[PDB]
Ligand binder design. Structure first.
Ligand SMILES: Nc1ncnc2c1ncn2[C@@H]1O[C@H](COP(=O)(O)OP(=O)(O)O)[C@@H](O)[C@H]1O
Ligand SMILES: Nc1ncnc2c1ncn2[C@@H]1O[C@H](COP(=O)(O)OP(=O)(O)O)[C@@H](O)[C@H]1O
Ligand SMILES: Cc1cn([C@H]2C[C@H](O)[C@@H](COP(=O)(O)OP(=O)(O)O)O2)c(=O)[nH]c1=O
Ligand SMILES: Cc1cn([C@H]2C[C@H](O)[C@@H](COP(=O)(O)OP(=O)(O)O)O2)c(=O)[nH]c1=O
Ligand SMILES: [Cl-]
Ligand SMILES: [Mg+2]
Ligand SMILES: [Mg+2]
Ligand SMILES: [Mg+2]
Ligand SMILES: [Mg+2]
Ligand SMILES: [Mg+2]
Ligand SMILES: [Mg+2]
Ligand SMILES: [Mg+2]
Ligand SMILES: [Mg+2]
Lengths: 183, 187
């Protein structure tokens, strides 16, 4: 299998590009599974967090419980069948939002995640970058945006950072260009 | 300052019975008391999540931990800060026994998760009601309860100042008197 993720602020085009990427792979005859966080593991976590505000620690731990189920019940089985699995958000979302955004320490986040994810990491992560005011109270969102960019510059072999303000088809073509060597 | 006390033991061991008797006993002495419980003292909706069929044990622990994090921050630490005796019917040792010894999750990882979740908060005393496993989430069968029961006893041997191990099969009033005797010098 091949594991790919989409990351970025809300309104950065993740769901759009994940859809277009799955469609590209379908056109090439490649088995593909599209999934998302939160809720790919525990739908009830997503719906709970829609209407409950918690401490950052509790928030993260719920995202992590979802992720633990998501990895085991959805992603790993898809990869085991040889599918390309695309997740619209994954662990980097917690690192950016709960870590850089709400201030939780990354080493702890990563120790929690080590068991939650079974160490599963995407081969490539497409970060759709734009300022919060361009996404289709701002201080939090700037911390998240900058946090994503920090994660990306720490792992330049995994992250591909794209200008989320470009036209959709152009972004999709850029994702395809980056992906083709790996298929 | 406050005083933090917990009750632990298998399902059916008398924890709730004793926690409530203790709360009333201490209140009758004029002490401010806060009685709480896990799971649900932090995030009541966690009890719904915990019933999910076929949960991985990692997800199960993470749910318990999310509740615990909210519980410690929003309920227990503020109660202690007001000088209350805070009694929790279950706390972290439940996860160590059930998710660690029972489900087989690694104890150090459970503790690392917990360290931020609990902000390091540990009870002064933990009353372990030791119940035979046959007298006692999915897969809560005999084999599991034997592992949990023995796991609790291991935790108690490892922290023998904090744990007070009591025979859960003794009469309710005898157990209550034993709990009271351990607390007298602290209150
Ligand atoms: N490159 C783009 N240019 C203009 N509009 C876009 C682009 N990509 C997505 N959209 C539109 O922007 C909004 C957010 O896209 P979406 O894919 O839902 O982002 P996310 O999942 O990151 O929140 C949607 O209305 C979508 O149709
Ligand atoms: N010391 C005891 N001896 C016999 N039965 C007991 C004793 N303590 C409690 N019980 C009974 O055992 C059952 C379980 O008690 P409970 O306090 O709910 O345990 P837990 O909260 O540990 O599950 C209840 O029916 C209760 O009345
Ligand atoms: C996966 C994940 C998401 N999130 C946040 C980012 C988004 O604000 C939200 C996901 O939103 P989602 O459930 O797509 O709903 P909405 O589109 O109504 O925001 O969850 C985290 O904070 N941490 C995480 O680990
Ligand atoms: C607090 C906690 C409880 N548990 C289990 C013990 C019980 O089987 C279940 C609920 O505990 P509890 O609420 O004490 O029991 P009840 O539903 O009878 O009121 O959760 C764990 O597995 N780990 C934990 O961390
Ligand atoms: Cl001790
Ligand atoms: Mg989306
Ligand atoms: Mg999640
Ligand atoms: Mg995680
Ligand atoms: Mg990712
Ligand atoms: Mg009870
Ligand atoms: Mg709990
Ligand atoms: Mg915990
Ligand atoms: Mg305890």
């Amino acid at each position: 299998g091949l594991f790919l993720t989409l990351e970025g602020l809300d309104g950065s085009g993740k769901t759009t590009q994940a859809r277009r990427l799955a469609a590209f792979l379908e056109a090439q005859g490649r088995p593909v599974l599209l999934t998302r966080e939160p809720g790919g593991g525990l739908p009830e976590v997503r719906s709970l967090l829609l209407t409950q505000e918690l401490s950052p620690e509790a928030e993260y731990l719920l995202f992590s419980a979802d992720r633990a189920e998501h990895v085991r019940k959805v992603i790993l089985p898809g990869l085991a069948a040889g599918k390309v699995v695309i997740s619209d958000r994954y662990l980097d979302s917690s690192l950016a939002y709960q870590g850089y955004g709400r201030g939780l320490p990354l080493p702890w986040l990563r120790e929690v995640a080590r068991e939650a994810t079974r160490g599963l990491k995407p081969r490539l992560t497409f970060l759709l970058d734009l300022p919060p005011e361009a996404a289709l109270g701002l201080e939090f969102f700037r911390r998240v945006r900058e946090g994503y960019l920090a994660l990306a510059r720490a792992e330049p072999g995994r992250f591909v950072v794209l200008d989320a303000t470009l036209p959709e088809e152009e972004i999709a073509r850029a994702i395809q260009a980056h992906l083709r060597p790996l298929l």
